[PDB]
Amino acid sequence: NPETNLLFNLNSCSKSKDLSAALALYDAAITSSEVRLSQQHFQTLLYLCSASITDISLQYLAIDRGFEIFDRMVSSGISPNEASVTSVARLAAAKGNGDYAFKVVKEFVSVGGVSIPRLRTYAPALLCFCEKLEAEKGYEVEEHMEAAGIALEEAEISALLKVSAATGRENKVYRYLHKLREYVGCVSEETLKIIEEWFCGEKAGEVGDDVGMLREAVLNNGGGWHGHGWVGEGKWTVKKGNVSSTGRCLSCSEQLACVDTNEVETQKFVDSLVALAMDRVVFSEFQDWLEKHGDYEAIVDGANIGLYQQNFVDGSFSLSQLESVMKELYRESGNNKWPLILLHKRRVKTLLENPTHRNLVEEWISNGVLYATPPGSNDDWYWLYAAAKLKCLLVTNDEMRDHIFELLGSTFFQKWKERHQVRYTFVKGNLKLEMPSPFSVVIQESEKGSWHFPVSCENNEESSRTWMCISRQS
């Protein structure tokens, strides 16, 4: 059987990255006319041609003979899959042909059946245009990506920022300094140098505008950014320097913002939370109970605080620790609001039928500062909902890492936990609440057009992270 032998030998070439050998077998199949060409033969060759772009000894062969393999695949009556289109997009981008790398994807997305065009399909085009300082054709790829419903990562956004800085398009540079802020957060060392080069450059110091109305724009957006135009005269003062624990940069000596988590994104969180919670008993009775009587500054994971530093074997529970968390949050509250504790019905009873505790537990149920979550369903979803919907603190020592709560948007979560979650500790006797930080680690604009960029300390992120401060002085 010749078809199985060709597929077996082409795979043996792909294991060694031996393009020369597989590309010889490709000729033997065509000229002899003994073997039936098929999708898996064409695919194996195209991936190998894309794989060989990095190899110096095999790149010239892949670029010369790669497109003929793709053209034979289409004319044989086989539509090209996502990986095959990406392979030719990379091959075309390797020899500076951005327009073919673009239009090979436009044909693919135009079918729209089972295409599924990933970012790696469009990236060969986009990067090739930004390499050749073709800003206009670069931005076309972004439009066709964003319309096709594909997220841009840091590398693509940095490429578009780079080409904007090269062509001197100060409108577009401002666009992508907010795309990084929005879709990335803290930036790379390479990405930081792309930004540093702009603000140090002469074009950046030829832009300007007001004071009063921008304050509303900062508040309405969240706190991080005002989001329209540059502010100042010229000559930026770029410098790297660390930030305080209180949210105060040592370079410029101004206040960093603690940005509110996205209001529309928080509504997607709570709806997906109620959707999973409504699953066999009535969850909706808590929803209205919170809304009717619930204006607390903090929520407490009752099961966590009580079982903290207790033996899993003994089944020992600690109301005294849960009592301490109640009193300290009440003190730290300015208006003096007691937090809402959320325990199970199995844990509230047994606490209630202990005569020592009964009074204190009954007191909290009467005052509306403790809610019993019903059996069967988890308490997990009740205190997530309570803190998230009311937008307040959540006291628990539990970084929620699991595949049951996998609908957690890990982009939105962590970013939510850093703003809202309160950790704690009981050193022998006394309690110590570890509050969330008074400033967020994200890109942000001041009212005076002063930017701040945090660089991602990938190894050991701490208070000694370097921030790249950029201000005007006017």
Neighbours of 407 (CB within 10 A): 10
Site for Zn ion in 236-255 (CB under 5 A): 249, 251-252
Residue with Cβ nearer Zn ion (191 or 444): 444
Site for Zn ion in 372-431 (CB under 5 A): none
Distance in Å, CB of 373 to Zn ion, minimum? 45
Residue with Cβ nearer Zn ion (181 or 389): 181
**Annotated binding residue 64:** no
> Mask of contacts with Zn ion, 43-82, x by CB under 5 A?
----------------------------------------
Contact 423, 397 (CB under 8 A): yes
Site for Zn ion in 453-472 (CB under 5 A): 469
Distance in Å, CB of 450 to Zn ion, minimum? 7
Distance in Å, CB of 262 to Zn ion, minimum? 24
**Annotated binding residue 18:** no
Q: How many residues bind Zn ion (CB under 5 A)?
A: 4
Site for Zn ion in 343-362 (CB under 5 A): none
Output the CA–CA distances (angstroms, integers) from residue 326 to 144, 224, 338, 439, in the order listed: 53, 32, 7, 25
Rounded-to-5 percentages of helix, strand, coil across the chain: 50, 10, 40
Residue with Cβ nearer Zn ion (187 or 249): 249
**Annotated binding residue 379:** yes
CA 346 to chain centre: 38
Residue with Cβ nearer Zn ion (62 or 249): 249
What is the number of the residue whose Cβ is closest to Zn ion? Answer: 252
Residue 425 is which amino acid?
T
Residue 119: its H or E element: helix 119-131
CB contact set of 26 (below 8 Å; sequence gap of 6+)? 45, 69
Site for Zn ion in 90-119 (CB under 5 A): none
Residue with Cβ nearer Zn ion (251 or 440): 251
Distance in Å, CB of 458 to Zn ion, minimum? 22
Distance in Å, CB of 223 to Zn ion, minimum? 16
Residue with Cβ nearer Zn ion (231 or 469): 469
180 sits near Zn ion (criterion: CB under 5 A): no
Distance in Å, CB of 251 to Zn ion, minimum? 4
Long-range contacts of 444-447 (CB under 8 A, 24+ apart): 444/181, 444/223, 444/224, 444/225, 444/256, 444/257, 444/259, 445/218, 445/224, 445/225, 445/226, 445/227, 446/254, 446/471, 447/211, 447/214, 447/215, 447/218, 447/226, 447/231
As given in the structure block, the two tokens for residue 37 are: 């060409």
Chain position carrying tokens 């704690």: 424
**Annotated binding residue 301:** yes
According to DSSP, the residues that pair with 455 across neighbouring strands are 187
Residue with Cβ nearer Zn ion (297 or 445): 445
Q: Over the Cα atoms of the chain, what is R_g?
A: 29
Q: How far apart are CA 82 and CA 108, in angstroms?
A: 8
> Mask of contacts with Zn ion, 252-291, x by CB under 5 A?
x---------------------------------------
Q: How far apart are CA 12 and CA 6, in angstroms?
A: 10
- What are the backbone angles phi and psi of residue 111, rounded to the nearest 5°? -70, -55
Residue with Cβ nearer Zn ion (150 or 259): 259
**Annotated binding residue 200:** no
Where does 238-348 have alpha helices with state H? 263-277, 284-292, 302-307, 319-332, 345-348
Residues annotated within a binding site = 249, 252, 301, 379-380, 398, 452, 469
Which residues are near Zn ion by CB under 5 A? 249, 251-252, 469
Residues annotated within a binding site for Mg(2+) = 301, 379-380, 398
Residues annotated within a binding site for Zn(2+) = 249, 252, 452, 469
